[PDB]
């Protein structure tokens, strides 16, 4: 609910380059700076004689919104022999997957093809590059002697990638073994220690990889997507992967121990062709310290209220029990054909309220199918199934392809160092990427007292200033207290607005008035300090003379509303705080006239 | 004022009916998978026509039949990108294979049976790599492309899909780098599906809607164990039916006639749109039975139907695959 939509940072790449197909943060920690990483699979490059090899741009957050391309491989196609091309880097979709951990960046080209060392073939083993500050290397574990579809020849390694807690890679390749799919995990220390540019099939000592199985598992797509999380209490991150076509297209999700690649747990979709498993994510959502699993089914159709089917998509939330099995809830979509669930991005603690949050996209929903994101907050009981915020795509389709706003997104990084995780959203269909900043959350406690609450017309005590008269008075006291987490101003300013006898409308005589103004309203700009003691302001009201009004039964309600001066509370960048979600816009008290 | 439909009426607990006209005119389209795995089934498709008309005369009131073929998307990794196999996917087995293709329309609906007989005999076999075939792409084009195939206005539109393996799904195309959803329009520049390499396969939702909007009933002619796959999908596709081709062949004529019988006996009902907010339908059979709205009624031939519909808090009510839509509005 606290993501800034007033002035987000919009990044743009070259047209038709699918800029924004894959996004991530880059926080090197050896530079004390922070950047965005954006993938441009179909972008043209300077590589000799190559077309749409793809790029990955490093977009800078500080100062202007200008991006630069990272130089991983400036060479063209290598040769195995004279006029025998080894590599076919054209149309390799480099940058289709980006995933950064510390100063280490990993991009992959899932449509890279190579010749093989035994045969003049052209097979999509896929390849990846890994930069670590000053040194960059190649990583193609599917570029091996296990050639042809019977092996890794079509593995397309790098279709999905992710890092782990203990400096390991998790790479997926949905094409291995006649599209059974495959997962591969290699220590990053060895991907750098064994690299050799004259060796094309590199051996890795501590490699973990799934094994070819029965032919019934053909057309499974293991490695379509990957996430990481501990699911057996060993401390080491385990491997989670979607297998969307597995089990006669019901979809599945396999979990493997991150220490020897032995199967741990199996999820299974309920509907055929729903593509259960297109997306996956793993994060603790209920503050228990047990990674909870999120699975997308973009093409799921629900028996709607009219007994008719409609494709809206469905995500399945699964909380990891201490027992070891999962507690699973389901969550459907809203708009038809919006592909709700194409992307699922953990956000960390978006509001720093103690529980991690999560975003879920519907790339093809909303006004004119411009794509929407849905922010869901977590609770101690699970995931609050009501989205607290909706982000709407703001670009019309340039041509041919929809903007696909939300097809990819990344979060859980506080790029402005304000203590609140921010969110990157990409819309490759228009070659755009947005950085949504999280606003600080102020928690406010407001108080309002009225004493005495039974007023005696004949109890004339206070003297009305300006006249020799006496009137029946009663006190109105209001208090205010505010605090917040992270980067906030030392003092906040609220504009209080009290009104007496609110149940009466223009024309109807207002019965109670403020002593020092003889008016029913009272305005004060109160200034309290974040995390300091509460501040109160005592007032005095009185009633009109008995001979000025007849209604004595209707209650005299005292209505208060308190805004915040947002513009002044803003930080150096103009990012202004936001009041906590469930804060009353008004609090009211009551006093009554005393009859006989 | 007038009541110019086959459904009573043509335009609260109001009842509705339909007229089960006997002896419909039929338009069949043979959309056959010509992948390598079908090498033995095309040779059996040759002489099905002449006998089809022989068997179909009894139930149809004059009919026609067209023909088209499909294989898969002509891109990596579904096919081999090797120059020798990019056009001939059977180079290692030196067989006379024609090039792969997404969808080809060779013969519009024609009443001259000999024309169908010619177009089939002239058909060749293609090939690719991955088992699943791109059939849904072709089915959609066959439904929306009305001017190219020539679906008759007043004709229970039949589409016989003949394959031996499961089909590619919408998001399977991400492997090929195809990420733009299908637009559901007609894309035949010269009787050839051109977008097969730029738009991803259609989802079942997109496929169902376009089938219903054009009143097209589907017949799945499948052979291997993969018959049960298409059988388990009929719940998600109203108006479609499945039939297991006997591995001994010569079952096309028996399935199409047997499938047509059940198709005419089936009379479901569906809804459409609303006033921003139930339509609690309750269908009733010729025999006293409380049948849900979507439940239809089987074993119906030219007998009355019924089903009182309740509406409470511009809309259309479509019988399944009929050429008549009784609209309703306030």
């Amino acid at each position: 609910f606290n993501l800034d939509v007033d002035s987000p940072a919009e990044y743009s790449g070259p047209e038709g380059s699918y800029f924004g197909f894959a996004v991530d943060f880059f926080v090197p920690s050896a530079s004390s700076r922070m950047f965005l990483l954006v993938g441009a699979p179909k972008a043209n490059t300077t590589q000799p004689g190559i077309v749409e090899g793809g790029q990955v741009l490093k977009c800078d957050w500080s100062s202007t919104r200008r991006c630069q391309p990272i130089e991983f491989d400036a060479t063209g196609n290598r040769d195995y022999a004279k006029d025998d091309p080894l590599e076919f880097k054209s149309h390799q979709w480099f940058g289709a997957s980006v995933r950064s951990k510390q100063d280490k960046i990993l991009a992959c080209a899932p449509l890279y093809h190579w010749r093989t060392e035994m045969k003049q073939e052209r097979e999509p083993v896929g390849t990846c590059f890994l930069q670590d500050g000053t040194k960059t290397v190649e990583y193609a574990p599917c570029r091996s002697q296990d050639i042809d579809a019977d092996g890794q020849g079509f593995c397309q390694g790098g279709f999905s990638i992710d890092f782990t807690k203990a400096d390991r890679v998790l790479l997926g390749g949905p094409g291995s073994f006649y599209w059974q799919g495959q997962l591969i995990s290699d220590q990053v220390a060895e991907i750098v220690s064994k690299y050799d540019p004259n060796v094309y099939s590199i051996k890795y000592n501590n490699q973990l990889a799934t094994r070819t199985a029965q032919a019934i598992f053909d057309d499974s797509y293991l490695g379509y997507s990957v996430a990481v999380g501990d699911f057996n209490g060993d401390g080491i991150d385990d491997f989670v992967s979607g297998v969307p076509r597995a089990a006669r297209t019901l979809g599945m999700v396999y979990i493997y121990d991150g220490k020897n690649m032995s199967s741990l747990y199996n999820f299974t979709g309920e509907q055929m062709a729903a593509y259960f498993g297109f997306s996956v994510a793993a994060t603790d959502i209920n503050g228990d310290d047990y990674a909870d699993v999120f699975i997308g089914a973009p093409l799921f159709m629900d028996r709607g209220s009219d007994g008719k089917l409609q494709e809206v998509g469905q995500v399945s939330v699964s909380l990891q029990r201490a027992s070891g099995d999962f507690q699973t809830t389901k969550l459907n979509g809203f708009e038809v054909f919006a592909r709700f669930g194409s992307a699922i991005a953990p956000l960390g603690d978006l509001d720093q309220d103690g529980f991690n949050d999560i975003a879920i996209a519907a790339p093809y929903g909303g006004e004119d199918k411009k794509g929407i994101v849905y922010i869901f907050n977590g609770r101690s009981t699970g995931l609050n199934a009501v989205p607290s915020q909706i982000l709407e795509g703001q670009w019309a389709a340039r041509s041919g392809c929809p903007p696909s706003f939300g097809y990819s997104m990344k979060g859980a990084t506080d790029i402005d160092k304000n203590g609140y995780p921010d969110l990157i959203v990409g819309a490759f269909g228009v070659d755009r990427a947005i950085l949504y900043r999280a606003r600080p959350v102020i928690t406010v406690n407001a108080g309002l007292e009225v004493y005495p609450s039974i007023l005696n017309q004949d109890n004339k005590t206070c003297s009305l200033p300006g006249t020799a008269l006496k009137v029946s008075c009663f006190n109105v006291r209001f208090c205010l207290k505010a605090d917040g987490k992270g980067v906030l101003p030392r003092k906040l300013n609220f504009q209080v607005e009290l009104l007496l006898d609110k149940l009466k409308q223009k024309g109807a005589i207002r019965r109670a008035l403020f002593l020092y103004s003889r008016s029913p309203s009272h305005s004060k700009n109160m200034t309290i300090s974040r995390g300091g003691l509460m501040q109160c302001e005592e007032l005095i009201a009185y009633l009109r003379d008995e001979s000025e009004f007849r209604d004595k039964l209707t209650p005299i309600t005292i209505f208060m509303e308190y805004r915040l001066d947002y513009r002044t509370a803003a930080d150096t960048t103009g990012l202004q705080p936001i009041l906590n979600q469930f804060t009353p816009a008004n609090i009211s008290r009551q006093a009554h006239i005393l009859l006989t | 004022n007038e009541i110019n439909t086959q459904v009573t009426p043509g335009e609260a607990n109001f009842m509705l009916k339909v007229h089960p006209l006997k002896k419909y005119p039929v338009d069949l389209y043979y959309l056959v998978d010509v992948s390598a795995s079908m090498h033995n089934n095309i040779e059996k498709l040759n002489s099905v026509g002449n006998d089809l008309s022989r068997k179909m005369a009894f139930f149809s009131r004059d009919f026609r039949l067209g023909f088209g073929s499909y294989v898969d998307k002509t891109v990596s990794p579904y096919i081999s990108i090797h120059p020798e196999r990019i056009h001939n996917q059977c180079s290692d087995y030196n067989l006379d294979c024609m090039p792969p293709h997404g969808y080809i329309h060779v013969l519009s609906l024609t009443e001259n049976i000999t024309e169908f007989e010619k177009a089939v005999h002239r058909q060749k076999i293609s090939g690719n790599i991955d088992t699943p075939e791109g059939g849904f792409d072709a089915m959609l084009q066959a439904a929306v492309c009305e001017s190219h195939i020539g679906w008759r206005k007043e004709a229970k539109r039949l589409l016989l899909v003949m394959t031996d393996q499961t089909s590619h799904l919408a998001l399977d195309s991400k492997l090929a780098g195809i990420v733009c959803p299908n637009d559901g329009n007609c894309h035949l520049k010269n009787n050839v599906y051109v977008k097969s390499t730029t738009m991803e396969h259609p989802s079942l939702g997109q496929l169902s809607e376009k089938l219903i909007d054009n009143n097209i009933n589907v017949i799945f002619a499948v052979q291997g164990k993969q018959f049960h796959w298409y059988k388990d999908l009929l719940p998600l596709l109203p108006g479609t039916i499945a039939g297991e081709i006997e591995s001994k062949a010569a079952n096309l004529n028996n399935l199409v006639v047997e499938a047509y019988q059940k198709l005419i006996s089936e009379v479901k009902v569906q809804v459409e749109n609303q006033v921003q907010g139930y339509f609690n339908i309750t269908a009733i059979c010729p025999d006293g039975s409380r049948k849900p709205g979507m439940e239809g009624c089987r074993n119906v031939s030219n007998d009355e139907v019924l089903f009182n519909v309740t509406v409470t808090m511009y809309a259309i009510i479509k019988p399944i695959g009929f050429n008549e839509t009784a609209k309703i509005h306030i």
Binding site: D148, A149, D150, Y178, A215, D218 | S35, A36, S37, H39, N40, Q89, C90, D92, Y93, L95, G127, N128, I129, D130, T131, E133, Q165
Partner: peptide, 9 residues
């Protein structure tokens, strides 16, 4: 070798 070309093969 399996897939579409397996029967031939």
């Amino acid at each position: 070798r399996r897939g579409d070309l397996a029967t031939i093969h």
